[PDB]
Design a protein around this ligand. Sequence first.
Ligand SMILES: Nc1ncnc2c1ncn2[C@@H]1O[C@H](COP(=O)(O)OP(=O)(O)O)[C@@H](O)[C@H]1O
Ligand code: BEF
Ligand SMILES: [Cl-]
Ligand SMILES: [Cl-]
Ligand SMILES: [Cl-]
Ligand SMILES: [Cl-]
Ligand SMILES: [Mg+2]
Length: 703
Amino acid sequence: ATTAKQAEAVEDSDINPWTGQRHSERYFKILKARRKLPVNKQRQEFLDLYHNNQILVFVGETGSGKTTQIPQYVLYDELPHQTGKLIACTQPRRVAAMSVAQRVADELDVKLGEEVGYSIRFENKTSSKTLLKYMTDGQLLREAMHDRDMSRYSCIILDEAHERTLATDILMALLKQLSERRKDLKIIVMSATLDAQKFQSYFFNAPLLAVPGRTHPVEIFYTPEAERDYVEAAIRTVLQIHACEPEGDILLFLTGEEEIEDACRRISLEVDEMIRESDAGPMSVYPLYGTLPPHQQQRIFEKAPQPFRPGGRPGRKCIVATNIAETSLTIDGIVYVVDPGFSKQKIYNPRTRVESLLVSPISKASAQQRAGRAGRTRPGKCFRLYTEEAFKKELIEQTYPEILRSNLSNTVLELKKLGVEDLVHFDLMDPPAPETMMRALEELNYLACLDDDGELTPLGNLASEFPLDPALAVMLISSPEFYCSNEILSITSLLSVPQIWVRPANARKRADEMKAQFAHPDGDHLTLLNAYHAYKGAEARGEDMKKWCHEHFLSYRHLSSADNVRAQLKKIMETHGIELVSTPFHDKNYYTNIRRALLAGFFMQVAMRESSNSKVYKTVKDEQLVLIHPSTTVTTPYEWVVYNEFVLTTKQYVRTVTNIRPEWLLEIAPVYYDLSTFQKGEIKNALTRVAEKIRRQQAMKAS
Ligand SMILES: Nc1ncnc2c1ncn2[C@@H]1O[C@H](COP(=O)(O)OP(=O)(O)O)[C@@H](O)[C@H]1O
Ligand code: BEF
Ligand SMILES: [Cl-]
Ligand SMILES: [Cl-]
Ligand SMILES: [Cl-]
Ligand SMILES: [Cl-]
Ligand SMILES: [Mg+2]
């Protein structure tokens, strides 16, 4: 009922309608600038759509005014309805939510934390006055876990929806479901780099509002030939920009903390050289990555240094960041973007059930976002450190959905916590294949994380609290019953990261020698345990651990990761009251306890020797024929083994293997190894003979 014209008349008022205070002069300067933005040209057109459709897809160039202006339009449109509900707008990163919340607070001439606020994990900058809240996807999902209808919100705006992250996809599915339940909820989906028709079609053929035009141009430059060392090329480019180009700050995208710190060091040294030798201007260098404290991350916004003298070469700021700065941000002063074209992206190893990070080429959408960090408040330039043909033909359009690159059992437990009942038909934008989902559900049911009705069990609920493959979580939770929760804590942590063994082709012998120091003849899990213990022991002596790992042919990266994970898991166990126990090393049962404890998590990954006449084993699951992997430390594999990994190469192997006793299977997983209903075959026969041996032995003793 209220038009863009009426709203504009209210915005022009001397009085702030939200607070009753006089509007400041800064407010009016900002308003004057705001009304020149592309999106403004279609405000009414937006309102119309917003009025006549529950869900709409909104696309417009980077910097066109989506994130700052659309929620304010909605704000002016919504609150006469007296609903007492909020408008939510989700950003990919916390620094983005905070930054844009401060900006919009400025635009509305209110205090941040009051009428405009933000919500991120560990910090809720909102109050009773809050009408518009910027938050992360994850935060909104965490709220959705306690409020399935999301009753606090009248409108939810999924920003940067092109980022197919786990949180984004799950949110989109939940919201698509909820839109059928709540007709008083509005949903806006927006991005500059979106597959519009895909998203429209997904949201019940929602309408599209497409806004043309850029505030400022961004000139794109490509390299004439490919260059392998992207770090050196990036540093060289930054230095050349500082030496030759006019005033303007630089945003360089790199892939990780260590790389970024090293690059910052090198850049700073070279800059010092240029200064003392060639009258170059000063340049401040800011690292930016996720493990930095958020308020320390906000340091990237401070002003570049002044020139050394009047008429001197410009002072400059250089931000060296991960894709934490790829979207959403307006860093005023930025003129140059340097895009090497790489980022750390999640991969999932289905044989080891391990999620890790791999430096990979970015998508076209990501490149466009990165470039879009410039051309917001002034013209910009983007130096892509790759050829135009490599952009046009080698880069994928959109990054593959994270849900298809993640541990699906984990995701399933999370979805159960979110109130999702039918997972087989859960309408994701890009669902895993029905068989993959069925496999996850099957495994979780056997692990007793889901009951036979498919409902979450207390064990499943507790397991979901751990950043682990659910089998590992169940193993850890169960470990106090085997009197070895410290060792299982360690082993779980190690099994949550990639292989720690390093075996270069030119030094394999030496590698083997070092590995021999940790080798346990009864199990690879125990060898892992030993390696970790040696690592911590060397660390306690105060040794250089990068050096130590290098000389022992162990991965410092993965061991360090596992150590951090262990700390986290320990904290969680202590929070939920799980006992942290160790059996004295010289106890007769010390190793048998641990070997038994493995079966609480891996009773479904067990293999039986076919004959004494051969070295072939058959897996309990799917009856596969395998060999024990030749990298094992198990010198004489038992008739029964537990294994971590199925390996398919020239031959079929099981890798990371520990000797077990068959009676342990019947004791520890009696429901799975229920012989009255177990599959007929040689494995069932062997287990039947084991059970009968135990029975005969007990009947005789009882007599
Ligand atoms: N913190 C800020 N400082 C200065 N100008 C800003 C700031 N945030 C936004 N702007 C101006 O408003 C424009 C729109 O920003 P935004 O709404 O974030 O665009 P989009 O979400 O479409 O990328 C920017 O291009 C810039 O001109
Ligand atoms: F599309 Be914008 F840069 F958030
Ligand atoms: Cl974040
Ligand atoms: Cl967060
Ligand atoms: Cl600094
Ligand atoms: Cl990061
Ligand atoms: Mg935006």
